[PDB]
Amino acid sequence: SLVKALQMAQQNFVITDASLPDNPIVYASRGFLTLTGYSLDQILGRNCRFLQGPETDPRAVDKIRNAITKGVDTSVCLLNYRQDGTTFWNLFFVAGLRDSKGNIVNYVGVQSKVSEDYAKLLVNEQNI
Amino acid sequence: EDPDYSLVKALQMAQQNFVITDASLPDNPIVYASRGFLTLTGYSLDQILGRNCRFLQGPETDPRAVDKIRNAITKGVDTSVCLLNYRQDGTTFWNLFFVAGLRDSKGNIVNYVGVQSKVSEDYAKLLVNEQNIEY
Ligand SMILES: *[C@@]12=NC3=[C]C([C])=C([C])[C]=C3N([C][C]([O])[C]([O])[C]([O])[C]OP([O])([O])=O)C1=NC(=O)[N]C2=O
Numbered sequence: 396s397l398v399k400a401l402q403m404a405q406q407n408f409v410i411t412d413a414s415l416p417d418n419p420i421v422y423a424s425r426g427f428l429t430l431t432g433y434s435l436d437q438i439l440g441r442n443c444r445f446l447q448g449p450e451t452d453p454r455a456v457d458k459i460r461n462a463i464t465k466g467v468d469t470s471v472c473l474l475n476y477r478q479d480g481t482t483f484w485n486l487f488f489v490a491g492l493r494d495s496k497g498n499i500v501n502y503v504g505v506q507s508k509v510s511e512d513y514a515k516l517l518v519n520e521q522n523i
Numbered sequence: 524e525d526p527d528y529s530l531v532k533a534l535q536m537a538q539q540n541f542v543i544t545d546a547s548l549p550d551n552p553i554v555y556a557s558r559g560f561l562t563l564t565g566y567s568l569d570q571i572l573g574r575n576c577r578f579l580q581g582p583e584t585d586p587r588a589v590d591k592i593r594n595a596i597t598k599g600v601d602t603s604v605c606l607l608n609y610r611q612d613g614t615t616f617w618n619l620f621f622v623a624g625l626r627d628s629k630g631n632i633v634n635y636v637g638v639q640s641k642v643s644e645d646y647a648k649l650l651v652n653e654q655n656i657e658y
Pocket residue numbers: 409410411418442443444445446447456457459460463473475485487489490502503504505506
């Protein structure tokens with residue numbers, strides 16, 4: 396009763412269109428704007444990867460990239476950057492929205508800023 | 524290990540037929556719609572976005588069923604309703620849709636997610652008899 400219990404804050408979510416080449420962001424909640432610091436215009440049309448930066452863990456990025464292309468739902472905690480250049484730890488959950496026949500045309504992303512000590516716990520788990 | 528998200532679950536059981544409304548905006552207008560909702564209703568994105576979902580309703584739509592959602596919506600309680608909707612061409616179908624409010628850190632509903640589905644005639648009769656029980 397933790398990983399899901401805390402993460403439950405859902406006002407931070409995006410929707411992406413997989414039918415467009417780089418699975419770009421087609422919708423972002425105002426909460427996502429608040430969290431990331433970006434305007435709607437500087438988000439829409441872009442792959443969510445733009446939040447990442449120098450100190451972002453590449454091996455973590457690889458894990459979700461694979462999860463997404465394989466269509467499996469997963470969550471991941473990695474280092475993200477705001478509009479201004481500050482960094483927060485992002486625990487986000489990505490889930491593919493399958494049509495009646497099982498094809499993914501949209502994806503849901505739910506983002507969460509997590510504390511330092513919780514991030515350390517989540518990252519170490521990923522290091523296995 | 525993995526979350527039981529109100530939003531994620533509502534969406535996964537949606538069958539690519541859903542919308543997102545913005546509660547902060549006047550009259551809780553649709554700010555996103557899946558292609559599934561597009562084909563179902565016959566409207567284009569330009570004919571949908573910025574509008575309240577009530578535009579799918581018409582002369583025969585049960586005003587009682589409508590009252591049910593309106594109430595559940597103002598009280599921020601998740602519910603599903605089966606009412607008669609009208610496509611852009613004016614043909615009718617029975618819509619069984621589910622709506623769930625999304626709250627911010629302060630508990631305020633800032634977004635709604637709706638999940639619509641066309642139901643067969645025989646199935647509708649069932650859902651409606653059940654619906655009528657509370658009266
Ligand atoms: C971003 N959230 C997010 C939400 C959705 C629904 C999807 C599909 C992806 C993300 N990403 C992951 C990112 O876009 C990309 O998939 C990964 O970087 C791996 O692919 P690449 O090609 O870059 O190796 C999110 N990434 C973030 O860093 N933060 C989020 O909140």
